[PDB]
Coordinates of C-alpha atoms and ligand atoms in Angstrom, one line a residue:
Chain A
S1 CA -1.7 -0.6 -29.8
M2 CA 0.5 -3.7 -29.8
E3 CA 1.4 -3.5 -33.5
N4 CA 5.0 -2.4 -32.7
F5 CA 5.8 -5.6 -30.6
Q6 CA 7.0 -8.8 -32.0
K7 CA 6.5 -11.7 -29.5
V8 CA 9.7 -13.8 -29.4
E9 CA 8.6 -16.4 -26.8
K10 CA 6.2 -17.3 -24.0
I11 CA 8.3 -17.2 -20.9
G12 CA 5.6 -17.7 -18.3
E13 CA 1.9 -18.4 -17.6
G14 CA -0.3 -18.6 -14.6
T15 CA -3.8 -17.8 -13.4
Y16 CA -2.7 -14.1 -13.4
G17 CA -2.0 -14.1 -17.2
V18 CA 0.9 -14.7 -19.5
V19 CA 4.4 -13.2 -19.9
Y20 CA 6.3 -13.0 -23.2
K21 CA 9.7 -11.9 -24.3
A22 CA 9.1 -9.4 -27.1
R23 CA 10.9 -6.8 -29.2
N24 CA 10.0 -3.3 -30.3
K25 CA 9.9 -3.5 -34.1
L26 CA 10.9 0.2 -34.5
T27 CA 13.5 0.7 -31.8
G28 CA 14.8 -2.9 -31.2
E29 CA 14.3 -2.7 -27.5
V30 CA 13.7 -6.1 -25.9
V31 CA 10.9 -6.1 -23.3
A32 CA 8.9 -8.5 -21.1
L33 CA 5.1 -8.2 -21.8
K34 CA 2.7 -9.3 -19.1
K35 CA -0.7 -9.8 -20.7
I36 CA -3.9 -9.7 -18.5
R37 CA -7.1 -10.9 -20.1
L38 CA -9.9 -8.6 -18.9
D39 CA -12.8 -10.8 -20.3
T40 CA -11.9 -13.7 -18.0
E41 CA -13.3 -12.5 -14.6
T42 CA -15.2 -9.4 -15.9
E43 CA -14.6 -7.5 -12.6
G44 CA -12.6 -5.0 -14.7
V45 CA -8.9 -4.3 -14.0
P46 CA -7.7 -6.6 -11.3
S47 CA -6.5 -5.2 -7.9
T48 CA -3.2 -6.8 -8.4
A49 CA -2.6 -4.9 -11.6
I50 CA -3.9 -1.6 -10.2
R51 CA -1.4 -2.0 -7.3
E52 CA 1.4 -3.2 -9.4
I53 CA 1.2 -0.4 -11.8
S54 CA 0.5 2.5 -9.4
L55 CA 3.3 1.4 -7.0
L56 CA 5.9 0.7 -9.6
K57 CA 5.4 4.2 -11.1
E58 CA 6.6 5.4 -7.6
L59 CA 9.5 3.0 -7.5
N60 CA 12.1 4.3 -10.0
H61 CA 15.4 2.8 -8.7
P62 CA 18.3 0.8 -10.2
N63 CA 17.4 -2.3 -8.2
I64 CA 13.7 -2.3 -9.0
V65 CA 12.4 -3.6 -12.4
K66 CA 11.3 -0.8 -14.7
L67 CA 7.8 -0.5 -15.9
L68 CA 8.1 1.0 -19.4
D69 CA 4.4 1.2 -20.5
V70 CA 0.9 0.1 -19.9
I71 CA -1.4 -0.6 -22.9
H72 CA -5.0 -1.0 -21.8
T73 CA -6.5 -2.2 -25.0
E74 CA -10.0 -3.5 -25.3
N75 CA -10.3 -6.9 -23.6
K76 CA -6.6 -6.9 -22.7
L77 CA -4.1 -5.0 -20.4
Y78 CA -0.4 -5.3 -21.1
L79 CA 2.3 -4.2 -18.7
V80 CA 5.6 -3.6 -20.6
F81 CA 8.7 -4.1 -18.6
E82 CA 12.4 -3.9 -19.2
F83 CA 13.8 -7.4 -20.0
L84 CA 16.4 -9.0 -17.7
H85 CA 18.4 -12.1 -18.6
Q86 CA 17.0 -14.5 -16.0
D87 CA 15.8 -14.9 -12.4
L88 CA 17.9 -15.8 -9.3
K89 CA 16.3 -19.2 -9.0
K90 CA 17.5 -20.3 -12.5
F91 CA 20.9 -18.8 -11.7
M92 CA 21.2 -20.8 -8.5
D93 CA 20.0 -24.0 -10.1
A94 CA 22.6 -23.6 -12.9
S95 CA 25.2 -23.1 -10.0
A96 CA 23.7 -26.0 -7.9
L97 CA 27.2 -27.7 -7.9
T98 CA 29.7 -24.9 -8.2
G99 CA 27.9 -22.4 -6.1
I100 CA 28.0 -18.6 -6.2
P101 CA 31.1 -16.8 -5.3
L102 CA 30.9 -14.8 -2.1
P103 CA 31.6 -11.4 -3.7
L104 CA 28.6 -11.9 -6.0
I105 CA 26.4 -13.1 -3.1
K106 CA 27.4 -10.0 -1.2
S107 CA 26.8 -7.6 -4.2
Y108 CA 23.4 -9.2 -4.8
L109 CA 22.4 -8.9 -1.2
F110 CA 23.6 -5.2 -1.0
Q111 CA 21.6 -4.4 -4.2
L112 CA 18.5 -6.2 -2.9
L113 CA 18.7 -4.3 0.4
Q114 CA 19.1 -1.0 -1.6
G115 CA 16.0 -1.7 -3.6
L116 CA 14.0 -2.9 -0.6
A117 CA 14.9 0.1 1.6
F118 CA 13.7 2.3 -1.3
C119 CA 10.4 0.4 -1.3
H120 CA 10.0 0.6 2.4
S121 CA 10.9 4.4 2.4
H122 CA 8.1 4.8 -0.1
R123 CA 5.5 2.9 2.0
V124 CA 5.5 -0.2 -0.1
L125 CA 5.5 -3.8 1.1
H126 CA 6.6 -6.3 -1.5
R127 CA 5.2 -9.4 0.2
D128 CA 6.5 -12.0 -2.3
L129 CA 10.2 -12.0 -2.2
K130 CA 11.6 -15.3 -3.4
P131 CA 14.4 -16.1 -5.9
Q132 CA 12.0 -16.5 -8.8
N133 CA 11.0 -12.8 -8.4
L134 CA 14.6 -11.4 -8.4
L135 CA 16.0 -10.7 -11.9
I136 CA 19.6 -10.5 -12.9
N137 CA 21.4 -9.1 -15.9
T138 CA 24.7 -10.0 -17.5
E139 CA 26.4 -6.9 -16.0
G140 CA 26.0 -7.8 -12.3
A141 CA 22.7 -6.1 -11.5
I142 CA 19.9 -7.7 -9.5
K143 CA 16.4 -6.2 -9.3
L144 CA 13.2 -6.7 -7.3
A145 CA 10.4 -7.8 -9.6
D146 CA 6.8 -9.2 -9.5
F147 CA 5.0 -6.4 -7.5
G148 CA 1.5 -8.0 -8.1
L149 CA 1.3 -8.9 -4.4
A150 CA 2.6 -5.5 -3.1
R151 CA 0.6 -2.9 -1.1
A152 CA 0.9 0.6 0.0
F153 CA 1.1 0.6 3.8
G154 CA 0.2 3.2 6.4
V155 CA 1.8 4.7 9.5
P156 CA 1.0 2.9 11.7
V157 CA -0.1 -0.2 9.8
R158 CA -3.6 -1.6 9.8
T159 CA -4.5 -5.3 9.4
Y160 CA -3.8 -6.4 5.8
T161 CA -4.3 -9.6 3.8
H162 CA -3.2 -12.7 5.8
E163 CA -2.6 -14.9 2.7
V164 CA 0.8 -13.4 1.8
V165 CA 4.3 -14.5 1.0
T166 CA 5.2 -17.9 -0.6
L167 CA 5.3 -20.5 2.3
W168 CA 9.1 -21.1 2.4
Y169 CA 9.8 -17.3 2.6
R170 CA 6.9 -16.4 5.0
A171 CA 7.8 -14.7 8.3
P172 CA 6.8 -16.2 11.7
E173 CA 4.5 -13.3 12.6
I174 CA 2.4 -14.2 9.5
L175 CA 2.4 -17.9 10.3
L176 CA 1.4 -17.1 13.9
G177 CA -1.5 -14.9 12.7
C178 CA -0.5 -11.6 14.2
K179 CA -3.0 -8.8 13.7
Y180 CA -0.3 -6.5 12.2
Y181 CA 2.7 -7.1 10.0
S182 CA 4.9 -4.7 8.1
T183 CA 8.3 -4.2 6.5
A184 CA 9.9 -6.8 8.7
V185 CA 8.2 -9.5 6.6
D186 CA 10.2 -8.5 3.5
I187 CA 13.5 -8.6 5.6
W188 CA 12.6 -12.2 6.7
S189 CA 12.2 -13.2 3.1
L190 CA 15.5 -11.5 2.1
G191 CA 17.2 -13.4 5.0
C192 CA 15.9 -16.6 3.7
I193 CA 17.2 -15.7 0.2
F194 CA 20.6 -14.7 1.5
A195 CA 20.9 -18.2 3.1
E196 CA 19.7 -19.8 -0.1
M197 CA 22.4 -18.0 -2.2
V198 CA 25.1 -19.5 0.1
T199 CA 23.7 -23.0 -0.2
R200 CA 21.6 -23.0 -3.4
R201 CA 18.9 -24.7 -1.3
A202 CA 15.9 -23.2 0.5
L203 CA 16.5 -22.6 4.2
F204 CA 13.0 -23.6 5.4
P205 CA 11.3 -25.9 2.8
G206 CA 8.1 -26.8 4.7
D207 CA 5.2 -28.5 3.2
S208 CA 2.5 -27.1 5.6
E209 CA 2.2 -24.2 7.9
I210 CA 2.9 -26.3 11.0
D211 CA 5.8 -28.1 9.2
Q212 CA 7.1 -24.6 8.2
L213 CA 6.9 -23.3 11.8
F214 CA 8.5 -26.4 13.3
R215 CA 11.3 -26.2 10.8
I216 CA 11.9 -22.6 11.8
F217 CA 11.7 -23.5 15.5
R218 CA 14.3 -26.3 15.0
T219 CA 16.7 -23.9 13.3
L220 CA 16.3 -20.8 15.6
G221 CA 14.7 -22.3 18.7
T222 CA 11.0 -22.1 19.7
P223 CA 10.6 -18.5 20.6
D224 CA 9.4 -17.7 24.2
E225 CA 8.2 -14.5 25.9
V226 CA 11.8 -13.4 26.6
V227 CA 13.0 -13.6 23.0
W228 CA 9.6 -12.3 21.6
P229 CA 7.3 -10.6 24.0
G230 CA 3.7 -11.5 23.2
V231 CA 4.5 -14.6 21.2
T232 CA 2.6 -17.0 23.4
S233 CA -0.6 -14.8 23.0
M234 CA -0.5 -14.7 19.3
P235 CA -3.7 -16.0 17.5
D236 CA -2.2 -19.1 16.0
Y237 CA 0.4 -19.8 18.7
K238 CA -0.4 -23.1 20.4
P239 CA 0.8 -24.1 24.0
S240 CA 1.4 -27.6 22.6
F241 CA 4.3 -26.4 20.4
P242 CA 7.4 -28.3 21.2
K243 CA 10.0 -26.1 22.8
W244 CA 13.2 -26.7 20.8
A245 CA 16.5 -25.3 22.1
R246 CA 18.3 -22.7 20.0
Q247 CA 21.3 -24.2 18.3
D248 CA 24.5 -22.3 17.8
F249 CA 23.6 -19.8 15.0
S250 CA 26.8 -20.6 13.2
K251 CA 25.2 -23.9 12.2
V252 CA 22.3 -22.3 10.4
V253 CA 24.4 -21.4 7.3
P254 CA 27.8 -23.0 8.1
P255 CA 29.8 -21.2 5.3
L256 CA 29.0 -17.7 6.6
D257 CA 31.8 -15.9 8.3
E258 CA 31.5 -13.7 11.4
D259 CA 30.1 -10.7 9.6
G260 CA 27.7 -12.7 7.3
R261 CA 26.4 -14.7 10.3
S262 CA 25.9 -11.4 12.3
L263 CA 23.8 -9.9 9.4
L264 CA 21.8 -13.1 8.8
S265 CA 21.0 -13.4 12.6
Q266 CA 19.6 -9.8 12.5
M267 CA 17.5 -10.6 9.4
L268 CA 16.0 -13.7 11.0
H269 CA 15.4 -12.1 14.4
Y270 CA 12.0 -13.4 15.7
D271 CA 10.5 -10.1 17.1
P272 CA 9.7 -8.1 14.0
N273 CA 10.1 -4.8 15.9
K274 CA 13.7 -5.7 16.6
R275 CA 14.5 -7.3 13.2
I276 CA 17.1 -5.2 11.2
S277 CA 15.7 -2.7 8.7
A278 CA 17.0 -2.7 5.0
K279 CA 18.3 0.8 5.7
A280 CA 20.4 -0.3 8.8
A281 CA 21.6 -3.3 7.0
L282 CA 23.4 -1.2 4.4
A283 CA 25.8 0.0 7.2
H284 CA 26.6 -3.6 8.3
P285 CA 30.4 -4.5 8.3
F286 CA 29.6 -7.4 6.0
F287 CA 29.5 -4.9 3.1
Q288 CA 32.8 -3.2 3.9
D289 CA 34.4 -5.0 0.9
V290 CA 31.4 -5.1 -1.4
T291 CA 32.2 -4.8 -5.2
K292 CA 30.0 -5.4 -8.3
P293 CA 31.3 -8.6 -9.9
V294 CA 29.9 -9.9 -13.2
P295 CA 28.0 -13.2 -13.0
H296 CA 29.2 -16.3 -14.9
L297 CA 26.1 -17.0 -17.1
Chain B
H1 CA -28.8 -4.6 1.8
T2 CA -29.7 -1.9 4.3
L3 CA -28.8 0.9 2.0
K4 CA -31.1 0.6 -1.0
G5 CA -30.0 1.6 -4.5
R6 CA -30.3 5.2 -5.3
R7 CA -30.1 7.3 -8.4
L8 CA -28.7 10.6 -7.4
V9 CA -30.7 13.7 -8.2
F10 CA -28.8 16.9 -9.2
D11 CA -31.3 19.7 -9.5
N12 CA -30.3 23.3 -10.3
Chain C
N1 CA 4.6 0.0 19.5
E2 CA 5.4 -0.3 15.8
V3 CA 9.2 0.4 15.3
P4 CA 9.4 3.8 13.7
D5 CA 12.3 3.0 11.3
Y6 CA 10.6 4.5 8.1
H7 CA 8.2 6.8 9.7
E8 CA 10.1 10.1 8.8
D9 CA 11.0 8.9 5.3
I10 CA 7.4 8.1 4.7
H11 CA 6.1 11.4 6.1
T12 CA 8.6 13.3 3.9
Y13 CA 7.5 11.3 0.8
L14 CA 3.8 11.9 1.5
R15 CA 4.5 15.6 1.9
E16 CA 6.2 15.5 -1.6
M17 CA 3.3 13.6 -3.1
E18 CA 0.4 15.5 -1.7
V19 CA 1.6 18.5 -3.8
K20 CA 1.7 16.4 -6.9
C21 CA -1.6 14.5 -6.4
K22 CA -3.5 17.7 -5.6
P23 CA -6.5 18.5 -7.8
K24 CA -6.8 21.9 -9.5
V25 CA -8.2 24.3 -6.8
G26 CA -10.6 26.3 -9.0
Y27 CA -11.7 23.5 -11.3
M28 CA -15.4 23.7 -10.6
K29 CA -15.8 27.2 -12.0
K30 CA -14.8 25.7 -15.4
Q31 CA -17.4 22.9 -15.2
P32 CA -20.4 23.9 -17.4
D33 CA -23.0 21.7 -15.7
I34 CA -22.0 20.5 -12.3
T35 CA -21.4 22.5 -9.1
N36 CA -19.9 22.2 -5.6
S37 CA -23.4 21.4 -4.3
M38 CA -23.7 18.5 -6.6
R39 CA -20.2 17.3 -5.6
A40 CA -21.3 17.5 -1.9
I41 CA -24.4 15.3 -2.7
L42 CA -22.1 12.8 -4.4
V43 CA -19.5 12.6 -1.6
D44 CA -22.2 12.3 1.1
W45 CA -23.7 9.4 -0.9
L46 CA -20.2 7.8 -1.1
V47 CA -20.1 8.0 2.8
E48 CA -23.3 5.9 2.8
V49 CA -21.9 3.4 0.3
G50 CA -18.7 3.0 2.4
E51 CA -20.9 2.3 5.5
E52 CA -23.1 -0.2 3.6
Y53 CA -20.0 -2.2 2.5
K54 CA -18.0 -1.7 5.7
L55 CA -15.2 0.0 3.7
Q56 CA -12.3 1.7 5.2
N57 CA -12.3 5.5 5.7
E58 CA -9.1 5.5 3.7
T59 CA -11.1 4.1 0.7
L60 CA -13.5 7.0 0.9
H61 CA -10.7 9.5 1.1
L62 CA -9.0 8.0 -1.9
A63 CA -12.2 8.0 -4.0
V64 CA -12.7 11.7 -3.3
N65 CA -9.1 12.3 -4.4
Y66 CA -9.7 10.4 -7.7
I67 CA -13.0 12.3 -8.3
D68 CA -11.5 15.8 -7.8
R69 CA -8.5 14.9 -10.0
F70 CA -10.8 13.5 -12.7
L71 CA -13.1 16.5 -12.7
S72 CA -10.0 18.8 -12.8
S73 CA -9.4 17.8 -16.3
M74 CA -12.7 16.3 -17.7
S75 CA -16.0 18.2 -18.2
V76 CA -18.8 16.0 -16.9
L77 CA -22.7 16.4 -17.3
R78 CA -24.7 16.0 -14.1
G79 CA -26.2 12.7 -15.3
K80 CA -22.8 11.1 -15.4
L81 CA -21.4 12.5 -12.1
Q82 CA -22.6 9.4 -10.1
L83 CA -20.9 7.2 -12.7
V84 CA -17.6 9.0 -12.1
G85 CA -18.1 8.6 -8.4
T86 CA -19.0 5.0 -8.6
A87 CA -16.0 4.0 -10.7
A88 CA -13.8 6.1 -8.3
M89 CA -15.1 4.1 -5.3
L90 CA -14.6 0.9 -7.2
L91 CA -11.0 1.8 -8.0
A92 CA -10.3 3.0 -4.4
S93 CA -11.8 -0.3 -3.1
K94 CA -9.6 -2.4 -5.4
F95 CA -6.5 -0.4 -4.3
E96 CA -7.2 -0.3 -0.6
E97 CA -9.4 -3.1 0.6
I98 CA -8.7 -6.7 1.4
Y99 CA -12.1 -7.7 0.0
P100 CA -13.4 -5.0 -2.4
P101 CA -17.1 -5.3 -3.3
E102 CA -17.8 -6.9 -6.7
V103 CA -18.8 -4.6 -9.6
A104 CA -22.3 -6.0 -9.5
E105 CA -22.6 -4.3 -6.0
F106 CA -21.5 -1.0 -7.5
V107 CA -24.2 -1.3 -10.1
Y108 CA -26.8 -2.3 -7.5
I109 CA -26.0 0.7 -5.3
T110 CA -26.9 3.1 -8.1
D111 CA -30.4 1.5 -8.5
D112 CA -29.2 0.3 -11.9
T113 CA -28.7 3.8 -13.2
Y114 CA -25.7 2.5 -15.1
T115 CA -24.8 -0.9 -16.5
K116 CA -21.9 -3.1 -15.5
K117 CA -20.4 -2.2 -19.0
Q118 CA -20.7 1.5 -18.3
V119 CA -19.1 1.2 -14.8
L120 CA -16.2 -0.8 -16.3
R121 CA -15.7 1.6 -19.2
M122 CA -15.7 4.5 -16.7
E123 CA -13.1 2.6 -14.6
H124 CA -10.9 2.4 -17.8
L125 CA -11.4 6.1 -18.4
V126 CA -10.6 7.2 -14.8
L127 CA -7.4 5.0 -14.9
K128 CA -6.5 6.7 -18.2
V129 CA -7.1 10.2 -17.0
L130 CA -5.3 9.6 -13.6
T131 CA -2.5 7.8 -15.5
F132 CA -2.9 4.9 -13.1
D133 CA -1.5 7.1 -10.3
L134 CA -3.8 5.9 -7.5
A135 CA -1.5 5.8 -4.5
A136 CA -2.5 9.3 -3.4
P137 CA -1.9 10.8 0.1
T138 CA -5.1 11.5 2.1
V139 CA -6.1 13.4 5.2
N140 CA -6.5 10.0 6.8
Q141 CA -2.9 9.0 6.1
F142 CA -1.7 12.1 7.9
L143 CA -4.1 11.8 10.8
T144 CA -3.0 8.3 11.7
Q145 CA 0.6 9.6 11.8
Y146 CA -0.4 12.5 14.0
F147 CA -2.2 10.2 16.4
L148 CA 1.1 8.6 17.4
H149 CA 1.9 11.9 19.1
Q150 CA -1.0 11.8 21.7
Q151 CA -0.2 12.1 25.4
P152 CA -1.8 9.6 26.1
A153 CA -3.9 8.2 23.2
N154 CA -7.6 9.0 23.5
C155 CA -10.2 7.1 21.4
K156 CA -12.6 10.1 21.4
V157 CA -9.9 12.5 20.1
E158 CA -9.1 10.0 17.3
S159 CA -12.7 9.5 16.3
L160 CA -13.4 13.2 16.4
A161 CA -10.4 14.1 14.4
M162 CA -11.5 11.5 11.8
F163 CA -15.0 13.0 11.8
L164 CA -13.7 16.5 11.2
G165 CA -11.3 15.4 8.4
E166 CA -14.2 13.6 6.8
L167 CA -16.5 16.7 6.9
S168 CA -13.8 18.5 4.9
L169 CA -14.3 16.0 2.0
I170 CA -17.9 17.4 1.5
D171 CA -17.1 21.1 0.9
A172 CA -14.8 21.8 -2.0
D173 CA -15.1 25.4 -1.1
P174 CA -13.0 26.0 1.1
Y175 CA -11.2 22.7 1.6
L176 CA -9.6 22.3 -1.9
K177 CA -7.5 25.3 -0.9
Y178 CA -5.6 23.2 1.8
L179 CA -3.3 20.2 1.6
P180 CA -4.2 16.9 3.3
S181 CA -1.4 17.4 5.9
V182 CA -2.8 20.8 6.8
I183 CA -6.5 19.7 7.1
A184 CA -5.3 16.7 9.2
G185 CA -3.4 19.2 11.4
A186 CA -6.4 21.4 11.9
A187 CA -8.6 18.4 12.5
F188 CA -6.2 16.9 15.1
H189 CA -5.8 20.2 17.0
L190 CA -9.6 20.9 17.0
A191 CA -10.3 17.3 18.3
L192 CA -7.7 17.5 21.0
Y193 CA -8.9 20.9 22.1
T194 CA -12.6 19.8 22.1
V195 CA -12.1 16.6 24.1
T196 CA -9.1 17.2 26.4
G197 CA -8.5 21.0 26.1
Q198 CA -5.0 20.1 24.9
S199 CA -3.4 21.8 21.8
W200 CA -1.3 20.8 18.7
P201 CA 1.7 19.2 20.4
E202 CA 5.3 20.5 20.2
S203 CA 6.4 17.1 18.9
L204 CA 4.2 17.7 15.8
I205 CA 5.7 21.2 15.2
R206 CA 9.1 19.3 15.1
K207 CA 7.7 16.6 12.8
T208 CA 5.7 18.7 10.4
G209 CA 7.0 22.3 10.7
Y210 CA 3.4 23.4 11.2
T211 CA 2.4 25.6 14.1
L212 CA -1.0 26.8 15.3
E213 CA -0.2 30.0 13.4
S214 CA 0.3 28.2 10.2
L215 CA -2.7 26.0 10.7
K216 CA -4.9 29.0 11.7
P217 CA -6.6 29.7 8.3
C218 CA -7.7 26.0 8.0
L219 CA -8.5 25.8 11.6
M220 CA -10.9 28.8 11.4
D221 CA -12.7 27.2 8.4
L222 CA -12.9 23.8 10.1
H223 CA -14.2 25.3 13.4
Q224 CA -17.0 27.0 11.4
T225 CA -17.8 23.8 9.5
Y226 CA -17.9 22.0 12.9
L227 CA -20.2 24.6 14.5
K228 CA -22.6 24.5 11.5
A229 CA -22.5 20.7 10.9
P230 CA -25.9 20.0 12.3
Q231 CA -27.5 22.4 9.8
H232 CA -25.5 21.3 6.7
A233 CA -27.6 19.9 3.8
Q234 CA -25.4 16.7 3.9
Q235 CA -25.7 14.7 7.1
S236 CA -24.3 11.2 6.4
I237 CA -20.9 11.8 8.1
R238 CA -22.7 13.2 11.3
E239 CA -25.0 10.1 11.3
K240 CA -22.0 7.8 10.9
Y241 CA -20.1 9.3 13.7
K242 CA -23.1 9.1 16.2
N243 CA -22.5 5.3 16.4
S244 CA -20.7 3.4 19.1
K245 CA -17.8 2.5 16.8
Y246 CA -16.9 6.2 16.8
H247 CA -17.8 6.8 20.4
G248 CA -20.7 9.0 19.4
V249 CA -18.3 11.9 18.8
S250 CA -20.5 13.8 16.4
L251 CA -22.9 14.3 19.4
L252 CA -20.3 16.2 21.4
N253 CA -20.8 19.9 21.7
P254 CA -18.3 21.8 19.7
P255 CA -16.2 24.5 21.5
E256 CA -17.7 27.9 20.8
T257 CA -14.2 29.5 20.9
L258 CA -10.7 28.3 20.2
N259 CA -9.0 31.0 22.1
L260 CA -6.5 31.6 19.3
Ligands
ATP301 N1 11.1 -8.2 -16.5 C1 11.4 -9.4 -16.8 N2 12.4 -9.7 -17.7 C2 12.7 -11.0 -18.0 N3 12.1 -12.1 -17.6 C3 11.0 -11.9 -16.8 C4 10.6 -10.6 -16.3 N4 9.5 -10.8 -15.5 C5 9.3 -12.1 -15.4 N5 10.2 -12.8 -16.2 C6 10.3 -14.3 -16.4 O1 8.9 -14.8 -16.7 C7 8.8 -16.1 -16.1 C8 7.5 -16.1 -15.2 O2 7.1 -17.4 -15.0 P1 5.8 -17.7 -14.1 O3 5.0 -16.4 -13.9 O4 5.1 -18.9 -14.8 O5 6.3 -18.2 -12.7 P2 7.8 -18.0 -12.1 O6 8.0 -16.5 -11.9 O7 8.8 -18.7 -13.0 O8 7.9 -18.8 -10.7 P3 7.0 -18.3 -9.5 O9 5.6 -18.9 -9.8 O10 7.7 -19.0 -8.3 O11 7.0 -16.8 -9.5 C9 10.1 -16.4 -15.4 O12 10.9 -17.3 -16.1 C10 10.8 -15.1 -15.2 O13 12.2 -15.3 -15.2

């Protein structure tokens, strides 16, 4: 069933499996092939794959990576995606010294918010937004990718898996062990990514859960019951936490203008039930002058 | 286990 | 409590999808070997399995969805019906659960009727037939939305609505005739009426477009199912809902009339 694909190069590997750049021998279409070995765990098709495939089939949108095919072939399962030039992390690293022009940062953020709002409006949590999982093309598009850690959520939510989101992008309600989390976790991640596009460095690069929390608290103040009702009764909240004052928010990402700082502040709001939605963010004045610039690759 | 294994029987 | 930012969008989406993810209403008449009675025995057993493994009610509902869709296009002999159900429950568990039981557990719970190989091959076949479209709307998904419209929330009403929605899973005739959002509506109203004497709230007419009049056919069926539940051949849901987790709601006396 894979006869018509020519592998061009291995572009990734992890415990999950392997990802190749490949081309369709008959049509010329370039694809990304994610190969899952089924004879490795012998628990059948992994949950991650079941979720990723089922949920992507319901997420057809210009800012979400397209799933083109699934070939469930003996001892292997291949997911066939559209191929995009590179990920956001690689792009930022290549721009470590020049930086990314504001119109492009803005376009990227607007696009990401469009794709995320679509996910949320289709009851999907992404739960692993980070620059490595955002794919760009040469034409100025950015797309959400890597839905292996996603899940369909309910209204209202139940308790879901606690071991979610890469540490640097993980929301405080997760770190503090809240019984429930929802769409706000993805907005937190996207706020962190917005900041990182402006600086090309991670906003909160902690090396443990407590180092991560203390970093956040030093940047945004240690939250109290006024800013976040319930915070002091959260399972992993500790009365010993130092109580850092909240610095001027303009200092968080100094280059952001009034509108950019306004939107970021709303993305990084502590109380998840007051943190801005992706939907609402689309109407923020920051996007009044949004365009679709082409990246310099 | 509390529930023991069971082969379901489907009579006419 | 939870900010309702996406609640309407999601409701709308689920209403679209429940029409697409619906099995074929008359499928059983085209099955040469299995019947609605055999399906009932299968679903009742899946109730037990979910209790044994402390699975979510959502997981049960999903598995039933998968089974009915599978049997809508695939003829199955009675000796393989439990294999279909077991693979369905495995898949639902992988989709929905934080910690799904391992495949060896699914083999065990059949008394080794099928091998691990068979269960895994059936998993592949179910995925193929359902074209990996596992994110189906359920009665449970609509119920949890409806519960947000209680005045005030009542644990007994929730548990009793859950019980009645679950009873619908057992009996393909009549319940295949109704959409998940409709059964959830009938279940919620019947629960409210039984416990508090309240009726389907005006806020839910606004939300759903359903009225008592539109819910009446399903409500009449569900009321009869409720009245007859202690005599039904299948009892696992009744037993389940006698327990303290569900406030013993299956022990409540059903209303003899709904005064519709
Ligand atoms: N649809 C796609 N088109 C093009 N490239 C892709 C696609 N999906 C994934 N990739 C690439 O495959 C590689 C995957 O690498 P790998 O899974 O080892 O970890 P990573 O994604 O680089 O980093 P992280 O572990 O932080 O996610 C990346 O280089 C990524 O850019």
